[PDB]
Write a protein that binds this ligand. Structure first.
Ligand SMILES: [Mg+2]
Ligand SMILES: [Mg+2]
Ligand SMILES: [Mg+2]
Ligand SMILES: [Mg+2]
Ligand SMILES: [Mg+2]
Ligand SMILES: [Mg+2]
Ligand SMILES: [Mg+2]
Ligand SMILES: [Mg+2]
Ligand SMILES: [Mg+2]
Ligand SMILES: [Mg+2]
Ligand SMILES: [Mg+2]
Ligand SMILES: [Mg+2]
Ligand SMILES: [Mg+2]
Ligand SMILES: [Mg+2]
Ligand SMILES: [Mg+2]
Ligand SMILES: [Mg+2]
Ligand SMILES: [Mg+2]
Ligand SMILES: [Mg+2]
Ligand SMILES: [Mg+2]
Ligand SMILES: [Mg+2]
Ligand SMILES: [Mg+2]
Ligand SMILES: [Mg+2]
Ligand SMILES: [Mg+2]
Ligand SMILES: [Mg+2]
Ligand SMILES: [Mg+2]
Ligand SMILES: [Mg+2]
Ligand SMILES: [Mg+2]
Ligand SMILES: [Mg+2]
Ligand SMILES: [Mg+2]
Ligand SMILES: [Mg+2]
Ligand SMILES: [Mg+2]
Ligand SMILES: [Mg+2]
Ligand SMILES: [Mg+2]
Ligand SMILES: [Mg+2]
Ligand SMILES: [Mg+2]
Ligand SMILES: [Mg+2]
Ligand SMILES: [Mg+2]
Ligand SMILES: [Mg+2]
Ligand SMILES: [Mg+2]
Ligand SMILES: [Mg+2]
Ligand SMILES: [Mg+2]
Ligand SMILES: [Mg+2]
Ligand SMILES: [Mg+2]
Ligand SMILES: [Mg+2]
Ligand SMILES: [Mg+2]
Ligand SMILES: [Mg+2]
Ligand SMILES: [Mg+2]
Ligand SMILES: [Mg+2]
Lengths: 90, 42, 273
RNA sequence: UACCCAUGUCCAGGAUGAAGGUAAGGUAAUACUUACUGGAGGUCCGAACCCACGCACGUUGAAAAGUGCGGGGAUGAGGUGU
RNA sequence: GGUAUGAGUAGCGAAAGAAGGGUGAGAAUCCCUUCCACCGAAUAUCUAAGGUUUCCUGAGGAAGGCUCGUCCGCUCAGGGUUAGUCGGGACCUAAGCCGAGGCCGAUAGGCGUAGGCGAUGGACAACAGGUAGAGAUUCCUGUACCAGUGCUAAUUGUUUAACCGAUGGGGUGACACAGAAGGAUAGGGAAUCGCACGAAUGGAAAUGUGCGUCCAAGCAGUGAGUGUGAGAAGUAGGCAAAUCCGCUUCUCGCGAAGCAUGAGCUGUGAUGGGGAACGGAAGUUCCUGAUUUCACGCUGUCAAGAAAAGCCUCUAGGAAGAGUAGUACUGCCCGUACCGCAAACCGACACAGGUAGAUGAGGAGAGAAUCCUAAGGUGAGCGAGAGAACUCUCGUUAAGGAACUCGGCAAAAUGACCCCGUAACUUCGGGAGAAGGGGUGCUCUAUUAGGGUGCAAGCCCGAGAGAGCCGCAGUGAAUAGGCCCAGGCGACUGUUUAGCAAAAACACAGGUCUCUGCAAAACCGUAAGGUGACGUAUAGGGGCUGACGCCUGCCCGG
């Protein structure tokens, strides 16, 4: 399903700075190929996707009182919609 | 020049899980570390 | 011919080399080359089983026609080439049907000569016949022991054997060693001494040149410790303080005969060397 | 770490001038001589690099084998990576 | 386990700092400015490994940091890594590893065939700009290429078979080392041109000073050169077949063409981009010149120098669809942060050690040496005084000059280039840089003579001599052999006791003895299977001796 592949939007100074450039940053399933992300975004948001760039983030090691461990590994997809395509809101 | 010149590949090829599994004595080692309850086999 | 190098260095001082006069090309036949990796005296267990081998120059194997099977069809000697894998030179034979093969270059084998193999071949140098067809007294090489197996016996540079007689289904050959033995008469041999007979005169000249040929240094038993060699140990130099000089593995190594006592081939040896 | 295997890679600069070749001579022809050419070598001098000869210092060290000043090899039986 | 003693003692880990300003509760130590100093074939720029968030921003100052601390590679929060083309995989194989059946073996297992895996190698399409707290050949802009896909349009084919074409054949792919001479281009430099200035202290409006003086892949042309006799018949081979390869014969022969390759150049790309100065000028000519490239191209040598895919071709096969043009669309996974001669890697440390590769400017120079600098980086995580003994690291030293000492150990001296000159002995190569001497700066004659470059203009290199001139001294600094006579040992270059021995020891070329007829002997293994060797007595194993020269006596009873 498409809403399994797209987890949640990414809201940061960086992610929010490129919304005007029609680039939408999502946290996507760690197994999702950029092709699956393209077709998922089109199904969910009714937009025309020009390109999808994708990057893997390894888990970040965090301490909390002599207990240490890794945050979740993340897969981040930046989805550029076409000029003619309607925007996604956030 | 000290002993211990690290190599990711050499570490797994000599001591890794699949190398341990590839021999009967290697499997004895895995069984022994499971018996002692090690967090890290291989 | 042997070229003697002038003593421009202590390294070159007594060194000699082939002039490679007989060699007619520096380029082997690409189709007849196979890769060859150095074993450096190591077994299929990876263990050193023969000492003093390792680290020579890289070599390609040339596939040699030791069988000389191609009966009736004439072969033109196209070139005499250097072969790093053996003491003899090799000759590229262009057969009239367009098959190319390498043979051991016999002494007197020239580019342009034609060679034949089989029952109708003349007793002319690089020709190959069954021993039953080869006259008594002929000088031969590349002698096969089992029919169709290929020549094994007299192949090294300058060597040659002589047909002595014909005793049943066996021919008597005097081998290069001076051993007289019986070869089955349907085995074939090539006519002529092998060639590159100057090969034994070469003075290697320097340690490094032995290293290029893949020979690592030999350490004498008498300068090892007693746990390494029967000659090991002793304060200062020691004589061989043993009833016999020994190999590194025990066993006497001066005069002690090692041919197996109950050997099947003993019936075919007429005179030991 | 030792030896080995396959596959890569490194070696500032300078010096010397082997064989061979060509041209003159030379001879019946050859040896041979001179000049030019040629560019050999576990060749020479010398950095990188590799080594570790002397001395000093260090000796609860900067270091569980180093540093400093000198030293040896430096196209090779060479160094080094995977 | 806690706590003493030694003791406020040793130590605080190679190094240059200074002041002013700021911040702050607090400042030698954080920030900024200026000057000073250090590295600069690195102490700079990339990048592999390795590390794994150390990266950026905002807070912090318990602990960590050998001092301090407002600061940090530390603590806490948020953030940050974008690819059809870069590297790896959806490609290829080497060593090696695994290995269906198989062979061998008390068990376990060992070996090995087909077949696989396996880079350190092969193949393979993207460049220049912009942007920035943190990525960038990845984002954006511009301009491309590679492989596909559909959709239009013509075109041709639809069983003497367009087209595709093997898992098969063949070619290529495909390779060492050394040397020499070239072409080109990077780089370097000088003028030119552009812009700015006109000056502190005696002088200068100019031979004045400062700064700058251009640009991709792709596409289309060209091109130093480098290789390469073509055509036709014909076929005991290339597991079948072949029009392909191989082989043979014949005709035509030439340093000429084609044909392949090929650095670079010229156009375009660019009305674009960048650029000394909120702005946009100049882009030229000449010299020098690679360690890069043409290119292992050429020549030579012996020690004789991967494979496979890929690509091309051939048939065997399969075939109604195929290509051409145009259009728009499609292109997955992994890595991408940051450190990377280092405080982030290996050394328990923020440790004088170790760490592959690419790049690595100028003057003088042969040079990557040396000294001083450029770009760029850095002032080294304790300081302030003092200027005793003593210790270490250095500099100088009257007269003497090895008297020191086991021993000239250490230090001193020598040192570069040019010229003169050079003995014994010798294996005729050497010895030899033997030894021992002499010269070396600046000015003028002098854009000298004479070279290189070029169409010129110019630019570069450049002796021998003559005159002169200064110093105690002219490779004025730094960096650069001490030498000789004679003897022992080892011929020689090599090798060795990681960490007290580098040697006369080992090795070595050479000698000799001996074994070994090939399923060799020898060696590993219970065996299979191996090495020997894809070798075959001019070969292989073992013992001893150790270049070369002259030699190598007697004894076979044990
Ligand atoms: Mg990616
Ligand atoms: Mg460790
Ligand atoms: Mg041997
Ligand atoms: Mg000993
Ligand atoms: Mg001993
Ligand atoms: Mg013993
Ligand atoms: Mg003894
Ligand atoms: Mg004695
Ligand atoms: Mg190697
Ligand atoms: Mg040398
Ligand atoms: Mg000593
Ligand atoms: Mg040193
Ligand atoms: Mg020397
Ligand atoms: Mg040297
Ligand atoms: Mg005290
Ligand atoms: Mg004290
Ligand atoms: Mg103190
Ligand atoms: Mg310090
Ligand atoms: Mg230097
Ligand atoms: Mg930081
Ligand atoms: Mg503190
Ligand atoms: Mg802070
Ligand atoms: Mg293999
Ligand atoms: Mg295989
Ligand atoms: Mg693979
Ligand atoms: Mg960055
Ligand atoms: Mg883009
Ligand atoms: Mg080849
Ligand atoms: Mg980066
Ligand atoms: Mg360090
Ligand atoms: Mg190193
Ligand atoms: Mg600077
Ligand atoms: Mg004095
Ligand atoms: Mg005096
Ligand atoms: Mg005395
Ligand atoms: Mg005295
Ligand atoms: Mg005395
Ligand atoms: Mg004495
Ligand atoms: Mg001394
Ligand atoms: Mg002299
Ligand atoms: Mg000087
Ligand atoms: Mg010696
Ligand atoms: Mg030596
Ligand atoms: Mg030692
Ligand atoms: Mg020592
Ligand atoms: Mg066997
Ligand atoms: Mg000896
Ligand atoms: Mg010997």
């Amino acid at each position: 399903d498409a809403r399994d592949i797209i987890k949640r939007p990414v809201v940061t100074e960086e992610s929010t700075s490129i919304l005007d450039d029609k680039k939408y940053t999502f946290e996507v399933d760690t197994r999702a190929t950029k092709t699956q992300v393209k077709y998922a975004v089109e199904e969910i948001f009714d937009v025309k996707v020009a390109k999808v760039n994708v990057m893997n983030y390894k888990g970040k090691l965090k301490r909390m009182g002599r207990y240490a461990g890794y945050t979740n590994k993340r897969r981040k997809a930046i989805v550029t919609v076409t000029a003619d395509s309607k925007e996604i809101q956030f | 020049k000290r002993t211990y010149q690290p190599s990711k590949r050499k570490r797994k090829k000599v001591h890794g899980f699949r190398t341990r599994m590839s021999t009967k004595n290697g499997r004895r080692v895995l069984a022994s570390r499971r018996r002692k309850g090690r967090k890290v086999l291989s | 011919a042997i070229k003697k190098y002038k003593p421009t260095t202590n390294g070159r001082r007594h060194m000699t080399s082939s002039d490679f006069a007989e060699i007619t090309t520096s380029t082997p036949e690409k189709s007849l080359l196979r890769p060859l990796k150095k074993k450096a005296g190591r077994n299929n267990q990876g263990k050193l089983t023969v000492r003093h081998h390792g680290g020579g120059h890289k070599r390609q194997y040339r596939v040699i026609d030791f069988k000389r099977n191609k009966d009736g069809i004439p072969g033109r000697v196209a070139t005499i080439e250097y072969d790093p894998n053996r003491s003899a030179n090799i000759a590229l034979i262009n057969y009239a049907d367009g098959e190319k093969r390498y043979i051991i270059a016999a002494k007197g084998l020239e580019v342009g000569q034609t060679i034949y193999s089989g029952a109708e071949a003349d007793i002319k140098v690089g020709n190959a016949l069954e021993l039953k067809d080869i006259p008594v007294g002929t000088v031969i090489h590349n002698i096969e022991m089992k029919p169709g197996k290929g020549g094994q016996l007299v192949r090294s540079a300058g060597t040659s054997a002589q047909v002595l007689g014909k005793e049943g289904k066996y021919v008597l050959i005097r081998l290069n060693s001076g051993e007289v033995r019986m070869i089955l008469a349907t085995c074939r041999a090539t006519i002529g001494q092998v060639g590159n007979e100057q090969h034994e005169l070469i003075n290697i000249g320097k340690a490094g040149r032995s290293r290029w040929m893949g020979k690592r240094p030999t350490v004498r038993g008498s300068v090892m410790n007693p746990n390494d060699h029967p000659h090991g140990g002793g304060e200062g130099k020691a004589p061989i303080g043993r009833k016999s000089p020994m190999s590194p593995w025990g066993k006497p190594t001066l005069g002690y005969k090692t041919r197996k006592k109950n050997n099947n081939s003993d019936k075919f040896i007429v005179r030991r060397r």
